[PDB]
Amino acid sequence: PIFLNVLEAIEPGVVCAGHDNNQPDSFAALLSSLNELGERQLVHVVKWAKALPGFRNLHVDDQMAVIQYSWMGLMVFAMGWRSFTNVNSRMLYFAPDLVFNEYRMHKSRMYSQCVRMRHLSQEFGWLQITPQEFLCMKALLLFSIIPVDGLKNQKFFDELRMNYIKELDRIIACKRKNPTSCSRRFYQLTKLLDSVQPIARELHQFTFDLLIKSHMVSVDFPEMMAEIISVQVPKILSGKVKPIYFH
Numbered sequence: 001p002i003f004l005n006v007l008e009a010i011e012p013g014v015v016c017a018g019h020d021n022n023q024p025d026s027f028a029a030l031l032s033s034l035n036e037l038g039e040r041q042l043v044h045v046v047k048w049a050k051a052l053p054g055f056r057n058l059h060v061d062d063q064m065a066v067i068q069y070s071w072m073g074l075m076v077f078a079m080g081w082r083s084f085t086n087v088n089s090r091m092l093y094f095a096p097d098l099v100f101n102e103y104r105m106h107k108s109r110m111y112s113q114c115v116r117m118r119h120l121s122q123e124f125g126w127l128q129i130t131p132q133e134f135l136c137m138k139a140l141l142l143f144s145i146i147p148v149d150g151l152k153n154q155k156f157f158d159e160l161r162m163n164y165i166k167e168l169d170r171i172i173a174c175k176r177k178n179p180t181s182c183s184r185r186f187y188q189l190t191k192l193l194d195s196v197q198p199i200a201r202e203l204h205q206f207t208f209d210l211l212i213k214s215h216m217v218s219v220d221f222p223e224m225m226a227e228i229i230s231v232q233v234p235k236i237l238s239g240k241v242k243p244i245y246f247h
């Protein structure tokens with residue numbers, strides 16, 4: 001189980017937001033903590049991605065672009081799984097010190113997106129998603145959103161993606177003889193994977209609008225994040241960069 005050994009080994013540890021939970025909730029404070037957390041997380045996502053089997057096959061410029069475009073979806077997926085395993089989807093577990101209840105969901109002005117993410121979180125339970133299916137699916141999300149014009153080396157990307165889809169096949173094929181059971185499983189998962197994109201899209205839009213009026217809402221945006229939102233996210237919202245759906 002070489003492939004799974006590796007994913008397990010590189011899976012990031014706990015990342016805290018540094019939020020002050022002794023202070024009443026406020027839009028500004030919550031979003032400032034979400035931005036800070038996002039920035040702390042990106043550092044880990046980058047290190048994780050670069051340690052993924054075959055990732056260095058990609059062109060240097062494609063590596064970062066791919067990481068920045070898929071960043072949101074990866075987090076959404078992981079956060080959903082964390083919510084599932086930690087609080088049984090009761091609340092959104094962004095971090096041990098940044099857990100959202102309905103009040104915070106409403107206060108953050110990200111209610112609709114939070115509700116979709118909670119539903120995703122419940123999906124891991126309804127579908128009895130295994131810890132290993134989760135790891136492979138999350139890896140697959142890194143190769144699920146590219147520019148319409150293609151990357152420097154599209155072919156190496158396509159190869160990479162194809163090989164990851166196959167590993168997911170393998171984790172499903174294991175302990176499964178009847179093809180009809182595997183085909184049904186593959187359907188549910190690819191179907192689950194597709195659902196992540198629309199959620200990331202909504203967060204992107206929310207994040208973009210917020211950055212534009214940040215100076216009006218007293219919301220602090222970290223250096224790196226701001227750059228990605230202003231340079232990368234617009235490409236996604238304008239359609240130049242799009243996700244790869246299964247269905």
Ligand SMILES: C[C@](O)(COc1c(F)c(F)c(F)c(F)c1F)C(=O)Nc1ccc([N+](=O)[O-])c(C(F)(F)F)c1
Nearest residue numbers: 034035037038071072075076079094203207225229
């Ligand atoms: C509002 C923002 O701070 C924006 O930061 C991000 C951003 F600007 C991006 F372009 C991203 F791709 C991204 F993943 C961000 F978090 C945010 O969505 N933060 C955030 C922090 C943690 C998590 N998390 O732990 O999964 C999430 C998420 F993914 F929505 F749930 C968002």
